Amino acid sequence: MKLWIDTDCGIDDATAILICLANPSIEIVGISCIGGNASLQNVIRNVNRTLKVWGKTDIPIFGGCQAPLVQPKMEIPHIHGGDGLGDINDNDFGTNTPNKLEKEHAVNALIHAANTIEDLNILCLAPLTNIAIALSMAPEAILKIKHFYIMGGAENGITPYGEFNWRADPEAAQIVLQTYPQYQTTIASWTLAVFNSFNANDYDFFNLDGNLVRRFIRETWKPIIAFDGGRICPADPLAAFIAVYGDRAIKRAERLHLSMVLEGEKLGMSLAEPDEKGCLVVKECDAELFVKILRELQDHQ
Amino acid sequence: MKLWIDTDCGIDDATAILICLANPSIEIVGISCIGGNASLQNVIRNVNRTLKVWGKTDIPIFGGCQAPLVQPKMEIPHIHGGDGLGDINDNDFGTNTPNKLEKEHAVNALIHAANTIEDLNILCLAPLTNIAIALSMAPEAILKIKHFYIMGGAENGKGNITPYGEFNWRADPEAAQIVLQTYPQYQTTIASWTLAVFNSFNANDYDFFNLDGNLVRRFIRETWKPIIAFDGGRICPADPLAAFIAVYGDRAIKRAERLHLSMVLEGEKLGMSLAEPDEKGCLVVKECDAELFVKILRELQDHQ
Amino acid sequence: MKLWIDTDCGIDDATAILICLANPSIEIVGISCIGGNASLQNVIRNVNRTLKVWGKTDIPIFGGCQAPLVQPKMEIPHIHGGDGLGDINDNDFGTNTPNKLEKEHAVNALIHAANTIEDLNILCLAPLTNIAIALSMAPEAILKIKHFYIMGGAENNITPYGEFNWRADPEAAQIVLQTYPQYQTTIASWTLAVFNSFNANDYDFFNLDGNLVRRFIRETWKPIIAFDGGRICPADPLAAFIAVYGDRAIKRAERLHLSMVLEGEKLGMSLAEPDEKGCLVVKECDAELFVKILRELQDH
Amino acid sequence: MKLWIDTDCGIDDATAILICLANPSIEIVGISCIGGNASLQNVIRNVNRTLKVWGKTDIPIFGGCQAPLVQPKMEIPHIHGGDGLGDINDNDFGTNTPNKLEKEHAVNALIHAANTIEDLNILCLAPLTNIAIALSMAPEAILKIKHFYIMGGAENGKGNITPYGEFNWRADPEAAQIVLQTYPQYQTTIASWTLAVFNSFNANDYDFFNLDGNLVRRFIRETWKPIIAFDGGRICPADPLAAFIAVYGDRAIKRAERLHLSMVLEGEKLGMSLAEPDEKGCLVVKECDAELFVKILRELQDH
């Protein structure tokens, strides 16, 4: 499976990228970077940290846009750390090295990849700002992409509070949801993250040592575990888990047509509607396989 | 003055491009196209028709985006004609020739120009689509642009396409909001629909859009004919007034205000430009030198 | 208890102010305003909004300085919406009315109050600028104040990032900490708030309706809950909770001497050192009494 | 010219204040006091002496802040004497009389003067604590001030109290940085410590600081006697040069470089003025008309 990754690489993005790196069936052809919550300069550095912590370093990193399309970024008190990646120490990992960054804008490089790579998939882990612009510049190119895997949205389960990716750039989410075919789109929603939430203190796979990747997992997740009683709502790792393992990862899903509310009190929320040609919105995951996948990426290779 | 022009080349767009074509102190470095008055393909041919009629086809034309940012499209063939240029006949002008269209997308073309052309200015005569996309991709690039001259909005709150919204900013309000909160409004000069109505002309007391004797006079007469009838004999030279201000600078303005502009992005007033006084906002032209304006429109039509 | 409140009234300021209005043992004798979460002008409006929704507008409101002492802007400008109070609609709350401002500067007013009010306590929910200036012009007046309750600093294992008040003006914080007696100071730290936070998907006390105050709390906190994964980090409300309810609110604290790092890579941080003549740094709170106090002020 | 003076009146302040008093086109509308060369309490006493010696005590005097904003009062090897004015005897000058001191704090009186007096200029001869605090409280008010004249700093990197940094800006660096980054540096002239050592006379080649015949010459002679003895008999008239520029305009200035100044509020070298070229920065006087300087220094001592 060929896969492009779009990320605002915070803590859970890095574990999601690591899930893809840990499966030999996955060839990551490029990683695009978008700002917003975490600054774009910080995202590019954190993608570099993740790839350097892993073995393979032959993946081009592209910087995209610096802000949502139109909505304000809404300043963020990053309690987990200012660098957007748990405030880890580069000297503890051997990643105090120059960051790699391609010259091409992420929008154009994504378009070229879409034009020149057959059976290209994309895993989107961030606000869809980069994707919406590429669909605007060249809808013919992005429509060649085989399938879309997106972390975003909150459908009715009650609809939990706190969905981030689409609320951060609702116009971009609408551009994606109105242009790329929803039938070819698979959603790992914030409702799914909240539904498969667990306490990391009941496990040990976020608190291991013995290799660099294990230390990375433990140190990046450390502040999230501390400040929230151990509770974890896995969003991006679940989206990578679904993109990488397919129906093996899915227990139940619902076909739903999705739209963004761009006006009024419900601005930035989503409308969902049963529709066999709509998004595949995953409802239940193989959680036993998910935590097994989380441990395996930290095994000695 | 090096100038970039972004147009949905309708009838008044083309007359604005002739104003810039007619002044030798103006260098048009490239023309970006966007849907609006008509569809993007019609705009591209309309610009080609305009350049061919004038006779200086050495200006690159770039195809922009195919739709607004988020809004559905808003073609008005009952105003600018089915082809966006008054449904003229190409045999009346000798423009039955292939159209020039460069390979590079207008957004990437404009970003490049802002990066390699010094003291670049832009004249924006159409919905804020190509420009907003380019400010999102490369703000550091587009902020290199010396000044922004934009036809759009209405500080009165009196629109055309809606009671509250001017067409270009109502056709893509998010794009209009993107420009107004990203490019420095202090380096931005606005020729609104307010200005277009205030400095409007009665086409049966003024005949400068009704001459023959040369190709330019025929082009201007035939293109403006359907829109003059649609307006009731009235001419609201919105785009030509914006080019007038960009080309002729201070001596084109009679009264202007410094106003911070912001878009109404929802509700029945979608597309409305709110205005409030601010010495760091946009120079919103209130009165143009109508006398010098008609003068330069006649001079580009003279046989000499 | 007579209480002065120094605030940059963002969203959690307004709820902290409501905790003081809801307790009959508390007499708010004056509210000073400083920039921070919002501009000084926006802070004055938001205090006016909070007092009007409650209904006890008989409180003087003074405007302070317009910037931190030495630092340039704010490390986190425009944090609680464009208006500083979650961009609420005045027409929904009936607060589109003339706002009250007093005309003496907030510094001179705090100096006057500390010189004329016996047993005056002060609650500081914002960057230490108004206080540092008044301490620099009349320390004789400010030291008469009975006790200081300050939201700020992050002490500690693990230290949560993002502390605003002392990072926004580290000189003002150091002025206060080395001039007003720390033994008469009680701290609700950013560490305490982070470790005493709630998620809207587990607790509903900021998602109620049925009267004006419940609507004010829900709408103000709404964009915080929406853009922070549901996380409610109630820093200023915890400070007010400690100031108003005292020993009932505190489960554990430590006597620590606090100073500011004013140079180097660690600019804006807080050095803590065990010291029985230092500030009372609250470490644990009665979370159950706190959630009930939040709900109590929202009763019909 | 309407002029407000902020002083830590040591010896060279008093001569500078006398420079302003001597010119009839200058209107001193108020003198604010701050700790520096000596205690605030001595500064208030030392301005009173200076006005009594001249003979015009109709100028209001305001006590300012008791300490720097952030820094400690720090070691003052009392070079201006124990009392701050060369340890002179009031019985020798007829100044054994009550002092005058206004009720208002200097910060509030400065704010009020800025809001109610047209075309007010300020002359700063001391650590800038009062001005920064008034800038903190009312930028609206202090920006109505036409021009700032400030003795302080050293754009050459050669201070006095520290090898880097001049006394007035080393004594309160945060306040000096507040003034620079809030009051427009283009409306600011600087008599630097570069300037005080540059235009520095040896006292044994002039007699303008060793005269009698009237009370003003005795005051000047007795107050400068200690400061002259410290140096190699040299005269680095820091304060008086600043007053000379503020009063006598362009003819006071010979060569002047527009430079943007900023403060090092950190590190082993603490309290120095970072100098860089800036057309919109301070007007740092580099050379003063020394001949005209000595003549007005003599004339103020006339009968």
Ligand SMILES: O=c1[nH]cnc2c([C@@H]3N[C@H](CO)[C@@H](O)[C@H]3O)c[nH]c12
């Ligand atoms: O009556 C009109 N209604 C809508 N659009 C236009 C235009 C076009 N829209 C813009 C004016 O709003 C201008 O660029 C012009 O090309 C002219 N007249 C009208």
Ligand SMILES: O=c1[nH]cnc2c([C@@H]3N[C@H](CO)[C@@H](O)[C@H]3O)c[nH]c12
């Ligand atoms: O040797 C000195 N060391 C420290 N301060 C001064 C001063 C005082 N400090 C300022 C010059 O540094 C000036 O205003 C003056 O009043 C003169 N000479 C010295």
Ligand SMILES: [Ca+2]
């Ligand atoms: Ca993410």
Ligand SMILES: [Ca+2]
């Ligand atoms: Ca047009």
Ligand SMILES: [Ca+2]
């Ligand atoms: Ca606050």
Ligand SMILES: [Ca+2]
């Ligand atoms: Ca002095």
